[PDB]
Amino acid sequence: GSANTAPAYKALATAAVIVPNLYKAVASAGDTILITLPAASTFVVSGSAVLSVSDTVCNTILTFTNSKTVKSGTNCVITGAVLSLTLNSAITDQTTVTINSGGQTTLVSGTGTTGPAYKAGTAAPISPAYLTSAAARSATSIVVTLPFTSTVNGATLTKATCDTIVEVLNGGDATKPRTLDSGTPCTLATTLLTVNLAATESFAPGDTVRIKSGNTVLLIGSAGGNAPYVQATTATPIALGYVTSSIATKATE
């Protein structure tokens, strides 16, 4: 009730079972998509428990926005509490995955046939988890290539902001991040992101760049309120992209 005088909720006659939902996707390792599950799971084929199913069976269970569908001649595989699959084409802009709207019974929790089955609930926006490449265009300017269009959604890109989006490691060790320029640390232009370091910091072979854990401001697509990026299983090497001087000592040299 909405007042003090109301009765309490009491014990159920029979213990109620929990229908599992679909966790946030938060994976794009290319086009290979990984969907994390709240627990261990297994498919139900021919009254038995098996980890591998085909595209025809797999398409019944899941649905995507923008008409993706799963790739033909491929096997959806579950290992641990994760689900691994491939799509018809690379996803550009937002995409969403969800459990079959008209119900389904092939995907069940536990590692046996007795356990419950999945249901629709709500969607799971897919977050990019990889970068294309990056290079040094100057001694303190480093430009990174996002796989898709992005947007920061009007956030002022002070140094307090940039440290949350992107970071530049030294010598491939995560304990020596490099200071940014307190003036204008970063900027965004479609697929290109600018990183400006401090005057004392300089580029050297072996550095690595990545998205800092907890990013929330950089997003996908043009519209705000979409999902941000996440960290990748391996950092992106930084390659040289500038030269100091080119001069003609001889006419043939």
Side-chain angles (χ1 to χ4, degrees), residues 95-125:
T95 289
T96 269
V97 65
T98 198
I99 305 273
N100 178 279
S101 171
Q104 56 101 48
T105 60
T106 315
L107 186 60
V108 316
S109 192
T111 57
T113 178
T114 57
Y118 279 70
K119 205 174 120 185
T122 196

mmCIF file of all heavy atoms in Angstrom, residues 95-125:
data_model
loop_
_atom_site.group_PDB
_atom_site.id
_atom_site.type_symbol
_atom_site.label_atom_id
_atom_site.label_comp_id
_atom_site.label_asym_id
_atom_site.label_seq_id
_atom_site.Cartn_x
_atom_site.Cartn_y
_atom_site.Cartn_z
ATOM 1 N N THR A 95 23.494 -1.149 -32.649
ATOM 2 C CA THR A 95 22.880 -2.448 -32.863
ATOM 3 C C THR A 95 22.505 -3.014 -31.502
ATOM 4 O O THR A 95 23.152 -2.721 -30.494
ATOM 5 C CB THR A 95 23.816 -3.401 -33.613
ATOM 6 O OG1 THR A 95 23.931 -2.980 -34.978
ATOM 7 C CG2 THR A 95 23.293 -4.833 -33.572
ATOM 8 N N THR A 96 21.453 -3.826 -31.483
ATOM 9 C CA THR A 96 20.900 -4.363 -30.251
ATOM 10 C C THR A 96 20.585 -5.841 -30.430
ATOM 11 O O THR A 96 20.191 -6.276 -31.513
ATOM 12 C CB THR A 96 19.644 -3.586 -29.852
ATOM 13 O OG1 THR A 96 20.010 -2.498 -28.995
ATOM 14 C CG2 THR A 96 18.627 -4.474 -29.154
ATOM 15 N N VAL A 97 20.767 -6.610 -29.360
ATOM 16 C CA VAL A 97 20.441 -8.028 -29.353
ATOM 17 C C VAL A 97 19.459 -8.291 -28.222
ATOM 18 O O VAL A 97 19.457 -7.596 -27.202
ATOM 19 C CB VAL A 97 21.697 -8.911 -29.211
ATOM 20 C CG1 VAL A 97 22.363 -8.691 -27.868
ATOM 21 C CG2 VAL A 97 21.342 -10.369 -29.404
ATOM 22 N N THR A 98 18.608 -9.297 -28.414
ATOM 23 C CA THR A 98 17.553 -9.596 -27.455
ATOM 24 C C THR A 98 17.089 -11.029 -27.669
ATOM 25 O O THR A 98 17.362 -11.638 -28.706
ATOM 26 C CB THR A 98 16.382 -8.613 -27.595
ATOM 27 O OG1 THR A 98 15.567 -8.655 -26.417
ATOM 28 C CG2 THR A 98 15.534 -8.952 -28.808
ATOM 29 N N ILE A 99 16.388 -11.568 -26.671
ATOM 30 C CA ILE A 99 15.865 -12.925 -26.780
ATOM 31 C C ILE A 99 14.559 -12.905 -27.569
ATOM 32 O O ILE A 99 13.868 -11.888 -27.657
ATOM 33 C CB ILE A 99 15.672 -13.574 -25.396
ATOM 34 C CG1 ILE A 99 16.976 -13.548 -24.596
ATOM 35 C CG2 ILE A 99 15.170 -14.997 -25.540
ATOM 36 C CD1 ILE A 99 17.886 -14.727 -24.858
ATOM 37 N N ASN A 100 14.219 -14.057 -28.146
ATOM 38 C CA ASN A 100 13.122 -14.130 -29.103
ATOM 39 C C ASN A 100 11.836 -13.578 -28.503
ATOM 40 O O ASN A 100 11.431 -13.960 -27.401
ATOM 41 C CB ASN A 100 12.927 -15.578 -29.555
ATOM 42 C CG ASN A 100 11.762 -15.740 -30.506
ATOM 43 O OD1 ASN A 100 10.611 -15.816 -30.086
ATOM 44 N ND2 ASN A 100 12.053 -15.772 -31.799
ATOM 45 N N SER A 101 11.194 -12.671 -29.243
ATOM 46 C CA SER A 101 10.002 -12.002 -28.733
ATOM 47 C C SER A 101 8.831 -12.961 -28.590
ATOM 48 O O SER A 101 7.996 -12.788 -27.695
ATOM 49 C CB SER A 101 9.620 -10.844 -29.653
ATOM 50 O OG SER A 101 8.361 -10.306 -29.292
ATOM 51 N N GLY A 102 8.744 -13.962 -29.458
ATOM 52 C CA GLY A 102 7.660 -14.923 -29.407
ATOM 53 C C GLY A 102 7.990 -16.150 -28.586
ATOM 54 O O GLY A 102 7.341 -17.190 -28.724
ATOM 55 N N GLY A 103 9.000 -16.045 -27.733
ATOM 56 C CA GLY A 103 9.390 -17.140 -26.874
ATOM 57 C C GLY A 103 10.434 -18.038 -27.513
ATOM 58 O O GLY A 103 10.740 -17.950 -28.699
ATOM 59 N N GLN A 104 10.990 -18.920 -26.690
ATOM 60 C CA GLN A 104 11.991 -19.870 -27.147
ATOM 61 C C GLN A 104 12.257 -20.854 -26.020
ATOM 62 O O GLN A 104 11.956 -20.583 -24.854
ATOM 63 C CB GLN A 104 13.286 -19.169 -27.570
ATOM 64 C CG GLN A 104 13.903 -18.303 -26.491
ATOM 65 C CD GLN A 104 15.067 -18.975 -25.806
ATOM 66 O OE1 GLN A 104 15.958 -19.513 -26.459
ATOM 67 N NE2 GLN A 104 15.070 -18.946 -24.480
ATOM 68 N N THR A 105 12.820 -22.005 -26.386
ATOM 69 C CA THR A 105 13.145 -23.031 -25.408
ATOM 70 C C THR A 105 14.501 -23.680 -25.636
ATOM 71 O O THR A 105 14.890 -24.539 -24.838
ATOM 72 C CB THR A 105 12.063 -24.123 -25.402
ATOM 73 O OG1 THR A 105 11.982 -24.728 -26.699
ATOM 74 C CG2 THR A 105 10.708 -23.536 -25.033
ATOM 75 N N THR A 106 15.232 -23.306 -26.686
ATOM 76 C CA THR A 106 16.492 -23.975 -26.987
ATOM 77 C C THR A 106 17.621 -23.532 -26.065
ATOM 78 O O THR A 106 18.557 -24.304 -25.835
ATOM 79 C CB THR A 106 16.888 -23.726 -28.441
ATOM 80 O OG1 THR A 106 15.749 -23.917 -29.288
ATOM 81 C CG2 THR A 106 17.995 -24.680 -28.862
ATOM 82 N N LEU A 107 17.560 -22.312 -25.534
ATOM 83 C CA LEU A 107 18.606 -21.777 -24.670
ATOM 84 C C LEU A 107 18.147 -21.859 -23.219
ATOM 85 O O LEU A 107 17.145 -21.242 -22.845
ATOM 86 C CB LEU A 107 18.939 -20.334 -25.051
ATOM 87 C CG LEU A 107 20.122 -19.700 -24.314
ATOM 88 C CD1 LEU A 107 21.393 -20.479 -24.574
ATOM 89 C CD2 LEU A 107 20.300 -18.252 -24.712
ATOM 90 N N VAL A 108 18.883 -22.617 -22.407
ATOM 91 C CA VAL A 108 18.516 -22.868 -21.021
ATOM 92 C C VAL A 108 19.745 -22.703 -20.140
ATOM 93 O O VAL A 108 20.878 -22.939 -20.568
ATOM 94 C CB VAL A 108 17.897 -24.274 -20.835
ATOM 95 C CG1 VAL A 108 16.893 -24.558 -21.937
ATOM 96 C CG2 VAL A 108 18.979 -25.348 -20.802
ATOM 97 N N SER A 109 19.502 -22.312 -18.893
ATOM 98 C CA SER A 109 20.559 -22.069 -17.922
ATOM 99 C C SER A 109 21.048 -23.401 -17.357
ATOM 100 O O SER A 109 20.705 -24.478 -17.851
ATOM 101 C CB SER A 109 20.053 -21.140 -16.825
ATOM 102 O OG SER A 109 21.116 -20.669 -16.018
ATOM 103 N N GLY A 110 21.862 -23.341 -16.307
ATOM 104 C CA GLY A 110 22.466 -24.536 -15.758
ATOM 105 C C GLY A 110 23.265 -25.269 -16.811
ATOM 106 O O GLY A 110 23.412 -24.781 -17.935
ATOM 107 N N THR A 111 23.794 -26.439 -16.465
ATOM 108 C CA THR A 111 24.472 -27.306 -17.419
ATOM 109 C C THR A 111 23.692 -28.597 -17.647
ATOM 110 O O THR A 111 24.276 -29.644 -17.935
ATOM 111 C CB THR A 111 25.891 -27.612 -16.948
ATOM 112 O OG1 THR A 111 25.850 -28.204 -15.644
ATOM 113 C CG2 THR A 111 26.719 -26.339 -16.901
ATOM 114 N N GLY A 112 22.366 -28.531 -17.519
ATOM 115 C CA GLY A 112 21.516 -29.686 -17.727
ATOM 116 C C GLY A 112 20.206 -29.270 -18.361
ATOM 117 O O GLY A 112 19.939 -28.086 -18.572
ATOM 118 N N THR A 113 19.384 -30.275 -18.666
ATOM 119 C CA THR A 113 18.116 -30.031 -19.342
ATOM 120 C C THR A 113 17.009 -29.589 -18.395
ATOM 121 O O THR A 113 15.994 -29.058 -18.858
ATOM 122 C CB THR A 113 17.667 -31.288 -20.092
ATOM 123 O OG1 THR A 113 16.403 -31.045 -20.722
ATOM 124 C CG2 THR A 113 17.539 -32.479 -19.144
ATOM 125 N N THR A 114 17.174 -29.791 -17.089
ATOM 126 C CA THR A 114 16.121 -29.444 -16.144
ATOM 127 C C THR A 114 16.014 -27.945 -15.901
ATOM 128 O O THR A 114 14.921 -27.459 -15.595
ATOM 129 C CB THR A 114 16.353 -30.157 -14.809
ATOM 130 O OG1 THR A 114 17.651 -29.821 -14.302
ATOM 131 C CG2 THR A 114 16.250 -31.666 -14.983
ATOM 132 N N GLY A 115 17.111 -27.205 -16.045
ATOM 133 C CA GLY A 115 17.143 -25.807 -15.687
ATOM 134 C C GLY A 115 16.190 -24.960 -16.506
ATOM 135 O O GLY A 115 15.681 -25.386 -17.547
ATOM 136 N N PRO A 116 15.931 -23.728 -16.043
ATOM 137 C CA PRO A 116 14.958 -22.863 -16.726
ATOM 138 C C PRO A 116 15.437 -22.368 -18.080
ATOM 139 O O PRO A 116 16.524 -22.737 -18.532
ATOM 140 C CB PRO A 116 14.771 -21.703 -15.742
ATOM 141 C CG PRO A 116 16.003 -21.681 -14.934
ATOM 142 C CD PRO A 116 16.467 -23.101 -14.825
ATOM 143 N N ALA A 117 14.630 -21.533 -18.731
ATOM 144 C CA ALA A 117 14.902 -21.046 -20.074
ATOM 145 C C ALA A 117 14.905 -19.523 -20.088
ATOM 146 O O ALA A 117 14.419 -18.870 -19.161
ATOM 147 C CB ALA A 117 13.868 -21.572 -21.075
ATOM 148 N N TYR A 118 15.456 -18.964 -21.160
ATOM 149 C CA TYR A 118 15.622 -17.524 -21.265
ATOM 150 C C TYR A 118 14.344 -16.863 -21.768
ATOM 151 O O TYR A 118 13.445 -17.513 -22.306
ATOM 152 C CB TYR A 118 16.787 -17.188 -22.194
ATOM 153 C CG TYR A 118 18.127 -17.290 -21.514
ATOM 154 C CD1 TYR A 118 18.638 -18.516 -21.143
ATOM 155 C CD2 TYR A 118 18.872 -16.159 -21.226
ATOM 156 C CE1 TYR A 118 19.850 -18.620 -20.514
ATOM 157 C CE2 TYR A 118 20.092 -16.255 -20.592
ATOM 158 C CZ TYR A 118 20.573 -17.491 -20.239
ATOM 159 O OH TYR A 118 21.787 -17.609 -19.607
ATOM 160 N N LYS A 119 14.273 -15.546 -21.585
ATOM 161 C CA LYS A 119 13.104 -14.778 -21.977
ATOM 162 C C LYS A 119 13.562 -13.426 -22.512
ATOM 163 O O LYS A 119 14.753 -13.111 -22.524
ATOM 164 C CB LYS A 119 12.140 -14.596 -20.802
ATOM 165 C CG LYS A 119 10.700 -14.366 -21.220
ATOM 166 C CD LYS A 119 9.779 -14.330 -20.044
ATOM 167 C CE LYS A 119 9.097 -12.981 -20.012
ATOM 168 N NZ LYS A 119 8.255 -12.820 -18.826
ATOM 169 N N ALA A 120 12.593 -12.607 -22.928
ATOM 170 C CA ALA A 120 12.900 -11.399 -23.685
ATOM 171 C C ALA A 120 13.446 -10.292 -22.792
ATOM 172 O O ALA A 120 14.611 -9.897 -22.914
ATOM 173 C CB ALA A 120 11.644 -10.923 -24.412
ATOM 174 N N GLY A 121 12.628 -9.789 -21.878
ATOM 175 C CA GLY A 121 13.043 -8.620 -21.119
ATOM 176 C C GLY A 121 13.356 -7.460 -22.046
ATOM 177 O O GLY A 121 12.600 -7.156 -22.974
ATOM 178 N N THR A 122 14.490 -6.809 -21.806
ATOM 179 C CA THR A 122 14.903 -5.619 -22.541
ATOM 180 C C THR A 122 16.139 -5.925 -23.385
ATOM 181 O O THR A 122 16.667 -7.040 -23.386
ATOM 182 C CB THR A 122 15.174 -4.454 -21.583
ATOM 183 O OG1 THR A 122 15.209 -3.224 -22.317
ATOM 184 C CG2 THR A 122 16.498 -4.647 -20.862
ATOM 185 N N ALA A 123 16.597 -4.904 -24.104
ATOM 186 C CA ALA A 123 17.665 -5.040 -25.079
ATOM 187 C C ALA A 123 19.035 -4.975 -24.409
ATOM 188 O O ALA A 123 19.162 -4.801 -23.195
ATOM 189 C CB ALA A 123 17.548 -3.946 -26.137
ATOM 190 N N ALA A 124 20.074 -5.120 -25.229
ATOM 191 C CA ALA A 124 21.462 -5.018 -24.784
ATOM 192 C C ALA A 124 22.255 -4.271 -25.847
ATOM 193 O O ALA A 124 22.726 -4.889 -26.817
ATOM 194 C CB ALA A 124 22.062 -6.394 -24.530
ATOM 195 N N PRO A 125 22.421 -2.954 -25.715
ATOM 196 C CA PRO A 125 23.229 -2.222 -26.697
ATOM 197 C C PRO A 125 24.645 -2.771 -26.751
ATOM 198 O O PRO A 125 25.241 -3.104 -25.725
ATOM 199 C CB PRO A 125 23.201 -0.779 -26.184
ATOM 200 C CG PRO A 125 22.120 -0.722 -25.180
ATOM 201 C CD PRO A 125 21.950 -2.086 -24.626
#
